[PDB]
RNA sequence: GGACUUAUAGAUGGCUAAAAUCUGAGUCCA
């Protein structure tokens, strides 16, 4: 319900400098712009998300101990936000560097944090009550470091003193998240880490201590900063003659985001202000009695209403599903004759075993994962994910070898009355049966389709929502009090860009017009080719309409 | 548009002792409750009986028997009502107890509707069709007066001149008709356009994006095809509820009302004890959008900034293979895109045909940006092509090329996180955990288990006809008669492809209750099996019987404030 | 504004979802 990150951020001399490897970005930067985009992103996706910021060791005046805060661990603000962005400009207009602001040296030799004040810090942060701030039910530290062997790691008595403080935050439910930096010169050595790290049972053992390069630094952080929002559970039957019953879970892996269902009502009347409630409410059309409460619902059938029983409704249901949710498996089936793209009803779910309902569920789908890849099959379920809901037919396909995460896709199928017809045409004629036009006209849309291919597929993280972007850019600014750059006066050179800034889909569209529009102004005839084409293609269209 | 339908049932002592006129009774019952729930002002129905000892009807004519009147619209009570008249008259004649009826229901109907436009029919239930005599000087009669066509049903060459001379006339089987009602029908939806605009690529994002029609069209550096949407999969959630409170009357079944909800708002007042709610005016009271840790109320003219001002567009970004594209990024419902010969020029149909062709033969999904209406949702989608097979003049066979639209997912939709490894396991840290012991005999055995119930024996539907055109699905009359198409039929053994069996359940029950309670008078109600048709649909198939208590048994498996928070 | 058809219909809603809410939608006549 309420997470919490805790970023700390080891200061060195490498940390500092821009890397090839971050197209000549500092790691440090790359770190803080990653959690601008962070806050930015769960401000819209889950704004009841506690994180804070601290850096270490720092020479700064306001440090306690060496560790600055940036800002505290609190549920994400404007406040917080605007302190980032205000950082990351005076950067920007050079007015000062990640050395200014940090107080740091390029000696060679600065001072280090020690680890024990480190530790004991994150533990007493998790701990405090903040009043306006809710209870966290999940505590993680987001540790970023550069330093493979600190000066902690000759002490082998210093090491045990820091086993226990480690643990001690394992005993508080505090979890690191690693994020261990490497680069193409220098490794890092996790052996120092992993033995701090490490516990004494069987699978939680600590995280991982893998080191990373900083080309993955962004990334990693935007995909452990989201959170595993359990859809549903429910038993998953195999054969219930044999009690083949095993436990499965379920998580939605993409949702619908719409802007402005996040709200509250405010009642306010001279100086009071209040909050509000809506309260649907109904009325007998007779009388106009408030019947709210009183109402029941029937099958209308004509002239005529008809109102069953709990009991009889119980015995309508039971003929083809049950009360609580399930998923029974009906049969299996090679995938080319089960998975299409043209026949998508709903979203997906991604499933995996549940071993605290049923154990061996692990065993079971690890087996199945491999013999239904190996086959190349899919399962035939039939039930309902929820007990409220209707049941229905669902494919369940393998996870690929090419995905991470490893477990079953949840499609659901559609039923008959659930495929709609396809409506009826004033005209049929599609000049097939001039096979030579047509067969141009194919020809020269495979070489336009040509220059448009997708080489590195459709990633949903290049397309943000514009209407999610500008819905909350406004509340945005109206709580910072910035003024709006909107200009009535705008120039359509001036209008053109600002559609692509508010919309990342337009700023594609633009490329491939201006890559038509760059092929016939060069007179190189192998570029000049896309443009040709295009007007071919027109040539087509024209000469079919004034002859047919 | 509007239809009249006249039944004629044979009361023969041969049509008593076989059962034939009760099945007939149930044939009525299913075709009138059915047409009751629709109440169509020009569906009309009218029945009379031949061969029967009661005389009453318009020409005095004996033997023929007005036993329901022309009657429109069809009412659920009336039905119930025919129905019981009709059971009446079956059990009194149970045990102890045709050609001028023919002209006597010509008669009625000509008085009946005039001369209006509406599709007359007759439908006649009756056995021996060899055993009547009917001379060619009364089939010379009865063509000519005729405008009428006939439906015919067998209950067990002659009879045959009727219907080979009376354009558009059939004949049916008793049990024909019995397993017809008896099996599921899918509802036929008319298709209703969603969006009409145009499929660009290299469209000028300034002529495209304003609420002006800048053609497009005449830009030769664009890819332009006026195209159409429609729906092509949408969900169900069953028979439309009502929501109602039961009256009193004096007749008391169970009488309801509609009842109609308006929106009241409220504060509470605290007195943890509990509040004390308040009605308030909707006028003082505003929406609080959340930012984060605050709430915010804006300003009028800012609360329209929040909007995203969006044109109507569909906009390629470009192509890729269908492998290309995982699967699990379709999050919505499916969507027709056709080509617009309506608002459009018939070069739109062939350019469009064109491009779903080459995407076909070349395998390719089209990633596009999709906008409906003005400031309606923008977004990402796959245009996956597809064929939709049609019923020819032509003895060749006739595919409609066309688009299916399906929504992708933004940035701010993806909630995947890394998950813990299922091969290979490991340790939170990472080290590899011990290989499970019996392994080797659980990857076996489970290989036998997937193979026990192998499905591909059942046929996935033919291509290009998982969709299904508008008009192979239309019919001259709203009778419930067998589909007589060849390959409709037994095409349902697609196991991906099954009725809409809590649609059905629903229906099925509604009948017997109306059947039972209402007809019979009973006052217990039994509810029916659901058909063993409809049962193994949703069962467990068995291709190769396996006996999986080995396998489970190696698997192991057993169960176990808000007042201050807005700000500036 | 009417007639007809559709209710397994046409839409909305949303802290990501209620066995929720509304009556809409298409065609033809003035």
């Known amino acids: ?548 | 548009s509007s239809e009249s339908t006249t039944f004629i049932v044979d009361v023969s002592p041969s049509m008593m002792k076989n059962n034939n006129v009760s099945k007939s009774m149930a044939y009525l019952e299913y075709t009138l409750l059915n047409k009751s729930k629709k109440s169509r002002k020009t569906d009309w129905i009218s029945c009379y009986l031949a061969n029967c000892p009661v005389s009453e009807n318009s020409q005095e004519i004996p033997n023929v028997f007005q036993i329901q009147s022309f009657l429109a619209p069809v009412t659920t009570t009336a039905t119930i009502g025919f129905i019981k008249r009709l059971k009446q008259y079956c059990d009194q004649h149970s045990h102890d107890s045709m050609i001028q009826c023919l002209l006597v229901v010509s008669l009625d109907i000509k008085q009946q509707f005039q001369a209006r436009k509406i599709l007359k029919q007759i439908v006649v239930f009756t056995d021996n069709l060899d055993d009547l005599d009917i001379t060619d000087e009364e089939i010379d009669l009865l063509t000519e007066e005729l405008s009428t066509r006939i439906i015919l049903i067998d209950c067990g060459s002659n009879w045959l001149k009727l219907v080979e001379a009376i354009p558009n006339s059939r004949i049916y089987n008793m049990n024909e008709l019995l397993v017809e009602i008896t099996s599921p029908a899918t509802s036929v939806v008319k298709p209703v356009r969603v969006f009409s605009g145009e499929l660009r690529l290299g469209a000028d994002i300034l002529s495209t994006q304003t609420s002006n029609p800048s053609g497009s069209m005449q830009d030769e550096n664009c890819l332009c095809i006026k195209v159409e949407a429609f729906p092509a999969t949408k969900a169900v959630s069953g028979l439309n509820r009502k929501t109602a409170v039961e009256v009193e009357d004096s007749q008391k079944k169970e009488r309801y009302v509609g009842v109609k909800s308006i929106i009241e708002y409220e504060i509470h007042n605290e007195g943890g004890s509990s509040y004390i709610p308040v009605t308030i005016s909707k006028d003082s009271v505003t929406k609080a959008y959340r930012y984060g840790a605050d709430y915010v109320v804006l300003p009028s003219v800012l609360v329209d900034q929040t909007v995203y001002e969006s044109f109507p567009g569909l906009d390629l970004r470009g192509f890729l293979n269908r492998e290309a594209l995982p699967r699990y990024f379709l999050t919505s419902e499916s969507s027709f895109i056709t080509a617009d010969t309506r608002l459009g020029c018939q070069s739109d149909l062939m350019a469009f045909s064109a491009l779903v062709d080459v995407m076909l033969e070349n395998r390719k999904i089209a990633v596009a940006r999709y906008v409906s209406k003005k400031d309606s949702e923008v977004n990402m989608c796959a245009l996956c092509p597809v064929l939709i097979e049609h019923s020819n003049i032509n003895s060749e066979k006739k595919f409609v090329k066309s688009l299916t639209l399906c929504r992708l997912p933004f940035a701010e939709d993806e909630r995947v996180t890394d998950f813990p490894k299922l091969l290979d396991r490991t340790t939170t840290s990472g080290v590899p955990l011990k290989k499970e012991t019996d392994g080797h005999q659980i990857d076996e055995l489970m290989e036998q288990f997937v193979d026990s119930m192998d499905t591909d024996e059942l046929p996935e539907i033919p291509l290009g006809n998982y969709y299904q055109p508008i008009g192979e699905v239309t019919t001259d009359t709203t009778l419930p008669l067998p589909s007589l198409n060849k390959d409709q039929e037994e095409n349902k053994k697609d196991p991906l492809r099954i009725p809409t069996v809590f649609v059905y359940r629903q229906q099925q029950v509604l009948l017997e209750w109306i059947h039972q309670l209402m007809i019979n008078d009973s006052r217990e109600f039994e509810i029916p099996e659901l058909p063993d048709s409809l049962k193994n649909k949703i069962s467990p198939y068995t291709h190769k019987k396996f006996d999986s208590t080995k396998l489970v048994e190696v698997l192991g498996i057993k169960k176990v404030k808000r007042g201050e928070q807005h700000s500036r």
Not at chain 1, 183 to 211: H, M, R, V, W
Request: overall charge negative; glycine content about 4%; some cysteine.
């Open chain 1, 1 to 548: 319900i309420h997470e919490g990150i805790l970023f700390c951020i080891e200061l060195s001399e490498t940390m500092f400098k821009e890397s090839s490897d971050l197209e000549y970005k500092s790691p440090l930067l790359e770190i803080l712009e990653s959690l601008d985009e962070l806050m930015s992103q769960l401000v819209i996706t889950r704004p009841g998300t506690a994180i804070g910021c601290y850096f270490y060791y720092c020479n700064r005046e306001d440090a306690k101990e060496g560790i600055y805060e940036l800002f505290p661990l609190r549920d994400i603000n404007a406040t917080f936000m605007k302190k980032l962005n205000d950082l990351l400009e005076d950067l920007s207009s050079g007015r000062i560097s990640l050395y200014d602001y940090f107080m740091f040296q390029q000696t060679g030799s600065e001072k280090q944090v020690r680890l024990s004040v480190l530790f004991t810090f994150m533990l007493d942060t998790f701990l405090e009550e903040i009043p306006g701030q809710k209870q966290l039910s999940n505590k993680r530290v987001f540790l970023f470091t550069d330093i493979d062997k600190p000066q902690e790691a000759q002490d082998i008595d210093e090491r045990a003193r820091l086993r226990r403080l480690t643990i001690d935050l394992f005993d508080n439910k505090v979890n690191f998240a690693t994020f261990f930096i490497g680069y193409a010169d220098k490794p890092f050595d996790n052996e120092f880490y992993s033995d701090i790290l490490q516990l004494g049972d069987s699978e939680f053992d600590g995280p991982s201590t893998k080191p990373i390069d900083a080309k993955y630094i962004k990334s990693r952080i935007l995909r452990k900063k989201e959170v595993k929002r359990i859809m549903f559970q429910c038993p998953l039957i195999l054969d219930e003659k044999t009690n083949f019953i095993v436990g499965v879970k379920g998580y939605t892996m993409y949702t619908h985001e719409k802007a402005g269902v996040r709200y509250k009502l405010v009642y306010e009347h001279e100086d009071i202000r209040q909050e509000a409630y809506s309260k649907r409410k109904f009325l007998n059309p007779i009388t106009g009695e408030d019947v709210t409460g009183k109402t029941v619902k029937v099958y209308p059938y004509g002239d005529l209403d008809i109102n069953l029983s709990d009991s009889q409704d119980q015995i309508v249901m039971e003929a083809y599903t049950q009360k609580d949710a399930f998923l029974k498996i009906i049969g299996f089936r090679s995938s080319s004759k089960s998975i299409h793209y043209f026949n998508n009803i709903d979203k997906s779910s991604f499933i995996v075993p549940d071993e605290a309902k049923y154990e061996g569920s692990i065993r079971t789908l690890a087996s199945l994962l491999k013999i239904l890849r190996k086959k190349d099959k899919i399962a035939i379920l039939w039930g309902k994910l929820k007990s409220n809901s209707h049941p229905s037919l669902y494919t369940l396909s393998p996870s690929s070898v090419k995905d991470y995460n490893e477990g079953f896709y949840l499609y659901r199928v559609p039923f008959l009355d659930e495929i709609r017809k396809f409506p009826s045409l004033l005209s049929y004629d599609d000049g097939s049966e001039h096979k030579l036009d047509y067969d141009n006209m194919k020809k020269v849309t495979q070489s336009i389709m040509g220059y448009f291919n997708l080489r590195d597929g459709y990633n949903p993280s290049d397309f943000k929502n514009p209407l999610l972007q500008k819905h909350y850019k406004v509340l945005h600014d109206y709580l910072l009090q910035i003024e709006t750059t909107f200009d009535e006066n705008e120039t359509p050179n001036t209008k053109k860009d600002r559609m692509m800034r508010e919309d990342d889909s337009l700023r594609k569209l633009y490329y491939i017009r201006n890559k038509i529009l760059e092929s016939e102004k060069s007179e190189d005839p192998i570029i000049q080719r896309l443009n040709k084409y295009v007007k071919i293609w027109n040539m087509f269209y024209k000469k079919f309409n004034d002859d047919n």
